[PDB]
Amino acid sequence: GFLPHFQHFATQAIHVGQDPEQWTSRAVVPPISLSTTFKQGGFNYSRSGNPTRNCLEKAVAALDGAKYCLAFASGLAATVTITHLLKAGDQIICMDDVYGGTNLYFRQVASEFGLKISFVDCSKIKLLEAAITPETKLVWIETPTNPTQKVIDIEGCAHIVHKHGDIILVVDNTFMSPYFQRPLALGADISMYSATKYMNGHSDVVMGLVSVNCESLHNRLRFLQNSLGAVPSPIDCYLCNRGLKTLHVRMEKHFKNGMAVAQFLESNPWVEKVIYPGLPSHPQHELVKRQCTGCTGMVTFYIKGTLQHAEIFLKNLKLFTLAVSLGGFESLAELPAIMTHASVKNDRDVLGISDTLIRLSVGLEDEEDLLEDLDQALKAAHPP
Amino acid sequence: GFLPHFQHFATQAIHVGQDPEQWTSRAVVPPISLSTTFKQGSGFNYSRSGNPTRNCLEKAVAALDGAKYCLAFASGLAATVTITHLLKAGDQIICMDDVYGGTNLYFRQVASEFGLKISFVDCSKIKLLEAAITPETKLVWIETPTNPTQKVIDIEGCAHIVHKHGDIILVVDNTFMSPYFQRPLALGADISMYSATKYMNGHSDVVMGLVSVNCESLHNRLRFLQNSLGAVPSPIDCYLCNRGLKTLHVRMEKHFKNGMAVAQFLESNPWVEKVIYPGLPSHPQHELVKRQCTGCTGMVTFYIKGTLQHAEIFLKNLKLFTLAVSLGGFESLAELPAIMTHASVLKNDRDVLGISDTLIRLSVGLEDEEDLLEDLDQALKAAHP
Amino acid sequence: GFLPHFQHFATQAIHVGQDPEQWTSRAVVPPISLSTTFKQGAPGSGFNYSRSGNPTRNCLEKAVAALDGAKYCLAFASGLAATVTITHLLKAGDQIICMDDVYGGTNLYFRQVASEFGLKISFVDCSKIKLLEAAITPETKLVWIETPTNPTQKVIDIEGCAHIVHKHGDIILVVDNTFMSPYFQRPLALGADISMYSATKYMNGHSDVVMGLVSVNCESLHNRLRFLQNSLGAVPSPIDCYLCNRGLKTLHVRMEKHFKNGMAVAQFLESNPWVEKVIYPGLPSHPQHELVKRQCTGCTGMVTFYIKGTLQHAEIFLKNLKLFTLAVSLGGFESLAELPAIMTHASDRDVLGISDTLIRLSVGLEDEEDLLEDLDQALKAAHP
Amino acid sequence: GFLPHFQHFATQAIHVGQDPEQWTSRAVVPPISLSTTFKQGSGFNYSRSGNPTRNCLEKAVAALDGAKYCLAFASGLAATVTITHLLKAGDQIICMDDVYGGTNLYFRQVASEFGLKISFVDCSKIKLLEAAITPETKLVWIETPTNPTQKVIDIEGCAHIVHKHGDIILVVDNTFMSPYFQRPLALGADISMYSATKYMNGHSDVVMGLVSVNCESLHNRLRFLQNSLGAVPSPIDCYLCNRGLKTLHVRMEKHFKNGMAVAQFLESNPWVEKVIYPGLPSHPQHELVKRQCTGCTGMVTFYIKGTLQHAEIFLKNLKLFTLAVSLGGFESLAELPAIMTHASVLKNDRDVLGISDTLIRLSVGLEDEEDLLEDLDQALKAAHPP
Numbered sequence A: 001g002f003l004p005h006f007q008h009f010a011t012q013a014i015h016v017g018q019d020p021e022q023w024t025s026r027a028v029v030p031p032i033s034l035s036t037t038f039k040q041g042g043f044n045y046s047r048s049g050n051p052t053r054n055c056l057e058k059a060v061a062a063l064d065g066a067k068y069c070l071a072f073a074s075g076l077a078a079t080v081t082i083t084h085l086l087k088a089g090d091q092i093i094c095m096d097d098v099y100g101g102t103n104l105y106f107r108q109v110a111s112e113f114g115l116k117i118s119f120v121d122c123s124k125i126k127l128l129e130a131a132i133t134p135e136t137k138l139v140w141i142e143t144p145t146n147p148t149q150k151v152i153d154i155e156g157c158a159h160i161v162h163k164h165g166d167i168i169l170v171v172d173n174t175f176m177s178p179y180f181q182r183p184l185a186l187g188a189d190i191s192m193y194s195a196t197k198y199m200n201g202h203s204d205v206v207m208g209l210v211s212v213n214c215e216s217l218h219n220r221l222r223f224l225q226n227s228l229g230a231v232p233s234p235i236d237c238y239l240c241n242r243g244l245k246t247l248h249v250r251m252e253k254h255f256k257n258g259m260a261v262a263q264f265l266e267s268n269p270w271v272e273k274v275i276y277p278g279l280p281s282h283p284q285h286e287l288v289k290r291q292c293t294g295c296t297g298m299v300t301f302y303i304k305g306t307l308q309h310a311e312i313f314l315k316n317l318k319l320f321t322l323a324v325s326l327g328g329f330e331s332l333a334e335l336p337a338i339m340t341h342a343s344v345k346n347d348r349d350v351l352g353i354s355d356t357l358i359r360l361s362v363g364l365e366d367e368e369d370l371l372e373d374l375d376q377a378l379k380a381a382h383p384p
Numbered sequence B: 001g002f003l004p005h006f007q008h009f010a011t012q013a014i015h016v017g018q019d020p021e022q023w024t025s026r027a028v029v030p031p032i033s034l035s036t037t038f039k040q041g042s043g044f045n046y047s048r049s050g051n052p053t054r055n056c057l058e059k060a061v062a063a064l065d066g067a068k069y070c071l072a073f074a075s076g077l078a079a080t081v082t083i084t085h086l087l088k089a090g091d092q093i094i095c096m097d098d099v100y101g102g103t104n105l106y107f108r109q110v111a112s113e114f115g116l117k118i119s120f121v122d123c124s125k126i127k128l129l130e131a132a133i134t135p136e137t138k139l140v141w142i143e144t145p146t147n148p149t150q151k152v153i154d155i156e157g158c159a160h161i162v163h164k165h166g167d168i169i170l171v172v173d174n175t176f177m178s179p180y181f182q183r184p185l186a187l188g189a190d191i192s193m194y195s196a197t198k199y200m201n202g203h204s205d206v207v208m209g210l211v212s213v214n215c216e217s218l219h220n221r222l223r224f225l226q227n228s229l230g231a232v233p234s235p236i237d238c239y240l241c242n243r244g245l246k247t248l249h250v251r252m253e254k255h256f257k258n259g260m261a262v263a264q265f266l267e268s269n270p271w272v273e274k275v276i277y278p279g280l281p282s283h284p285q286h287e288l289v290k291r292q293c294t295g296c297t298g299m300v301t302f303y304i305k306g307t308l309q310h311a312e313i314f315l316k317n318l319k320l321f322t323l324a325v326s327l328g329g330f331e332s333l334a335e336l337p338a339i340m341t342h343a344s345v346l347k348n349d350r351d352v353l354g355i356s357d358t359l360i361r362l363s364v365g366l367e368d369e370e371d372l373l374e375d376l377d378q379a380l381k382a383a384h385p
Numbered sequence C: 001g002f003l004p005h006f007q008h009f010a011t012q013a014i015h016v017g018q019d020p021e022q023w024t025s026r027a028v029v030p031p032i033s034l035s036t037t038f039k040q041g042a043p044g045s046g047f048n049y050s051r052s053g054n055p056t057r058n059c060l061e062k063a064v065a066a067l068d069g070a071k072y073c074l075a076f077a078s079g080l081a082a083t084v085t086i087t088h089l090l091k092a093g094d095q096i097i098c099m100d101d102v103y104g105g106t107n108l109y110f111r112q113v114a115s116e117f118g119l120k121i122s123f124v125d126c127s128k129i130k131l132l133e134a135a136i137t138p139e140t141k142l143v144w145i146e147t148p149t150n151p152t153q154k155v156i157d158i159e160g161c162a163h164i165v166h167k168h169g170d171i172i173l174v175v176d177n178t179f180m181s182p183y184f185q186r187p188l189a190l191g192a193d194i195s196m197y198s199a200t201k202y203m204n205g206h207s208d209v210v211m212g213l214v215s216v217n218c219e220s221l222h223n224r225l226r227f228l229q230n231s232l233g234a235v236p237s238p239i240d241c242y243l244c245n246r247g248l249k250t251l252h253v254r255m256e257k258h259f260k261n262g263m264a265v266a267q268f269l270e271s272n273p274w275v276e277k278v279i280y281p282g283l284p285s286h287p288q289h290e291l292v293k294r295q296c297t298g299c300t301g302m303v304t305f306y307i308k309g310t311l312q313h314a315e316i317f318l319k320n321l322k323l324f325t326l327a328v329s330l331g332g333f334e335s336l337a338e339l340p341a342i343m344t345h346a347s348d349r350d351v352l353g354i355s356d357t358l359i360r361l362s363v364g365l366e367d368e369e370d371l372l373e374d375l376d377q378a379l380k381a382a383h384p
Numbered sequence D: 001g002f003l004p005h006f007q008h009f010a011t012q013a014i015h016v017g018q019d020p021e022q023w024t025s026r027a028v029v030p031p032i033s034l035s036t037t038f039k040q041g042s043g044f045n046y047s048r049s050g051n052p053t054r055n056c057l058e059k060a061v062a063a064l065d066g067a068k069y070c071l072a073f074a075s076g077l078a079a080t081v082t083i084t085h086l087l088k089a090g091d092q093i094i095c096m097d098d099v100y101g102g103t104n105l106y107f108r109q110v111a112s113e114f115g116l117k118i119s120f121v122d123c124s125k126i127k128l129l130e131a132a133i134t135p136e137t138k139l140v141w142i143e144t145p146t147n148p149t150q151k152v153i154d155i156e157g158c159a160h161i162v163h164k165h166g167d168i169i170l171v172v173d174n175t176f177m178s179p180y181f182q183r184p185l186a187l188g189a190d191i192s193m194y195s196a197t198k199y200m201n202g203h204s205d206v207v208m209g210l211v212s213v214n215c216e217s218l219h220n221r222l223r224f225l226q227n228s229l230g231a232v233p234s235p236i237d238c239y240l241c242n243r244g245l246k247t248l249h250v251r252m253e254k255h256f257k258n259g260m261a262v263a264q265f266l267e268s269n270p271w272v273e274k275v276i277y278p279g280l281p282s283h284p285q286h287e288l289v290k291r292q293c294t295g296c297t298g299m300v301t302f303y304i305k306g307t308l309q310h311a312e313i314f315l316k317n318l319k320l321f322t323l324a325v326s327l328g329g330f331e332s333l334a335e336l337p338a339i340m341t342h343a344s345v346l347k348n349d350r351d352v353l354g355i356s357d358t359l360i361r362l363s364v365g366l367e368d369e370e371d372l373l374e375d376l377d378q379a380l381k382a383a384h385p386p
């Protein structure tokens, strides 16, 4: 009962921006144009625009259902560039469980330059409307959140935010990818990604992506892409565009493997709790089906016992690799308390990042091998 | 009578950061590590925070600058934006009046929107600079020689004045000279910054910024902002820039020889109004250039005789110089700053700075000297038959 | 009723050769080592020269070997370079038996080049038991077969061929496995001595690497091939090795999609009133369909068919394709179409069945319904 | 008193093949086209047969060789193997007696298995070359200077002798000199061949071969074998090599200056038995070098005094020179050919050629001269303390 799959997604991922008539050679794959500058006697300077990045941006825009897309050197760089749309005296409302890097940037950096940052549980209408002031210019939401996967009603959020006037709604769509969730179709003003994760999907490109429909909002972002210069390499653009060509077949396998991993973990006697949007046990599972076409490979769970049991489990994994990041073809496992949020503690506790919290990025390996790896590692821990 | 060349520069450019013992394979050239993440269970954890190929580049650039530390960024502008994030609302920035257009545009139209106060002053003179310094001043941004009129600033004199007033950061954008010819950190600057897009990489195929620093606390704050703002370069671009660094010494020497020859030809040409080249005795700060530099680059600025259209006729008659923006590559480029690069500086400021309708900026490349002179010769005769 | 899918294929494609412990950084993705040379003889046996061996190529070769069910694999600069290197295993006076309808480049090399250096070349229809064994002489040292053939997709009983060849002693059987990929067919498990690929096609799968691959089990045969890899030097770039190894990580989900799209296209074409004949191994109408099911786990996206009418109708159809792109090569994510008479086999040849109405499709990963519509409207343009 | 430097070399290395008008974007640097195939209707059809980035490189190298055509290959050895496929069973190949070990091994152990007869001749005395030519001779393969003893061959004299015997191809492996210092095609050679892995790319990060030719029929035969045998380079490698070419002139001049200083330091060093450097007056063909070359490279060969023990102590004590094979990069390398790069040459031919236990080959890089001399000084003193 998910939202129907987006039409022409695979076709557009392979063809949009890739027109061979763009090149004198009529190459079916766009060349990698490294050149920093161009003869005048189109393009003038690589930072302002270059063929390989433009092809990628055009492709991503179609996959987001957007008119425009802007590529950046990283997801955080995309976040920083979006925030430069504002001015001193503006207010930002940010979700209380956003990605750690987003939280850190708003709290310790953006707040230094006349921007007021308010962290709100945007799952509650009373708290979001109470936080909106005439100074509110930006609402930053992520869904599902990293790493506890709280889910936000995007269209409900947009309705609340957009009756208050001149407010931009950003959805960090990193966990879902545009194959499973289209925030712009749901009322968001900006669909933002860490392409470092699923979009590229091959664990070899750091990149951010920002898709938009509004004309003035696009021009303001395009100005900051060139003027701040947090631009991606044309080679990274090529590699990310290459990764996009398999996004549909990758994400479907992430869905299949992720669901199987989540169901196996939830029935495992050494697992205390599982958080996976595809499971009926997820508190927002019905909302997930209303606003998504499927689910990703990110599976979050709590192991029974203590930190010692989480450590024994993690150290006995042989296929899941103990590492940060996510969204690649390879399965990863991570303990957020020691690996990402090691500096955070009191905010950990309200957000549930405990000693037994484990986040899995379920990859594309054979399902039976992933389940077996989890099975033997959990038996090694065998907590009470 | 230039400063003696920096000792061991070529040796360090080829070897620093490149130690084969870093790799299990003992590869003589560092591998390109694209991996975004690293197995744990010590060293690296996430590519944006640090990765082998970038760290090798940063170590090499730091040595070339005489620096303890270096940070690589996605572009020169990204390096500028990251440096400016060191400050806070209420701080003042002093910027050189003749600066790269993108630097001027960023400070004037973006940074000023976030509680930062911006003052543009001619930092070649002390009366105007000290009049601009306020208790809120936290950053002084200079370029020398400036882009594009190539005004030269006494770096050590500027640093001494800036460092009397307490906790103020002096950045020298050293893009035009490269660390082979000028070491701002040896002259008292706090930061030596580059658009590595130009000479550092030198091959017109990498957009990148570089920031070298000595102060420990300044490095820790910049390193925090490199990871937290995420304006990081591709590991492949890092490899390509580090590859370009291996020929920086022989490239810059050829830029110097070709640049000097072009400047002398232009200065004796009957169709050239004025030449601005730090290597010529006619440059107003030539003696200062010899005291703070070991040589000069291929950037040649001159004013053509006649009007705006004579400058255009000259530019469109070139057959070896290519009409394009950017600089510092192996290929010779020509450009009219008023309409092409510093078109983002307001017109009133460009007239005060001498960025007129006849000012032309050359990036003299590594081609045969005779071919470059002949291209300039025939193009100038076409503009004035 | 196909062969069961090869176990652990997806897991091995992602993990074999990719061990993070190989690198001091413990990178989860192998770095690209461009270095031509390596420091020797330091205190405390390693690589010495890139052509002889380098980390990125060695990682690729180990991955491909596992995917082929092989002990060893050697990578080359192209599929043809792999073919030429294999032929250098022989000496003047040896005989080569080659299939009468191999890939044109294979045919051209044997006929016009190899025959000039003391090698006797015999072209035999290896689909016939008595024709193959009658051609074998005491001088026969190499039997080269391709299945299915390019482009008419004739299918050869690999195990039957190997059994017949290996009764006669010291003869090498090579199977060019380009059309099927190791995901759908394992010639070494069926008795072949060498499984050879143009990785330019499915193996890389992203139309941006030219490469050959050679997998083998026999120890002496591997040492002889390894000597020729270094001594002839037709080696691939380490960057290309990285790109091909990257493409391997999605081979299973790509090939599964090629199978599903290819089956739908082939089935659609066979019921189309303007198609004379369809040749697709997955269809029951294929003359060796039961044999395909016995020696393969599935089928690829290569669909061969004959259009009704004349050469002009074939041209009108190809001209009207909007999604399929008119170009040579195959095995990429994008759909391609080709008329072998004008494009590849131009320099009768009806004896092999490449007529004016022969069209070869490489069905890509686009949305199935978009591909079927493209074929439908293009076929209606011909014969209106 | 060398030949005058070739006119427009630097200009052409930077501009030939790099015309921005080739690309719709007008990029000043040619894009890297990885695409294996091309949409059909007027140029490319399949990457192995030809692709934009490789074609740009080939045009650039051709101009630098003073040639009409150039063909790029996956390695220097692949270029050698492709050239040899021009022949047929029954043909004879004459090869210089001192060549790169891999060249020697390929002809001796592989090409000889396919009806080709291989003769190793000291072509430095072109009297022995004329005695070796038979009606079956179709290919004469020389290197000058040779790897690693750096014997020098009169290319023009060699070409005159080879070409009066009719239809014989003369190849000069120009790897050690690069086209900046030597143009074999201008001296009568039919083919100028390189391991671009060395000086041409110059950055120790590309394995590649290059083949430049003027003859029309010879080019068509080579172009056919480039496509039909498929030993082609990656378009990315082509881009990297073309990038390296843009500094070839300034690199080679520094190799010349550093190589001369290293060679002079070694020759006056009391612990060095003999130095072989084409730029030194002591080189037996030094005057011939000045008549067919515009300068000299960084390859310096010498014999250390003493025994194998001293050669090992010297090599293990170097701090800047890296003990490794290959050459022509920005970094200085040192190597013992008898055990490392010419261990594949039979021991008997090794002693006859002077590839002994005390023979050391240096690839002098672009580091600061005084640092290079210091490293050699202390390492030689480690083998022979004062």
Ligand SMILES: *[C@H](N[C@@H](CCSC)C(=O)O)c1c(COP(=O)(O)O)cnc(C)c1O
Pocket: C049, C051, C233, D075, D076, D077, D078, D100, D101, D102, D103, D143, D147, D173, D175, D176, D194, D195, D196, D197, D198, D207, D208, D209, D325, D326, D327, D340, D341
């Ligand atoms: C390259 N010779 C190198 C290779 C080292 S192998 C132990 C050396 O150090 O001597 C070379 C070649 C071969 O070209 P490739 O690109 O295939 O390596 C050919 N000709 C000469 C003169 C060489 O030096």
Ligand code: MET
Pocket: A146, A324, A325, A326, A334, A339, A340, B045, B046, B049
């Ligand atoms: C530890 S810095 C990188 C964090 C990474 N994006 C993650 O959430 O796993």
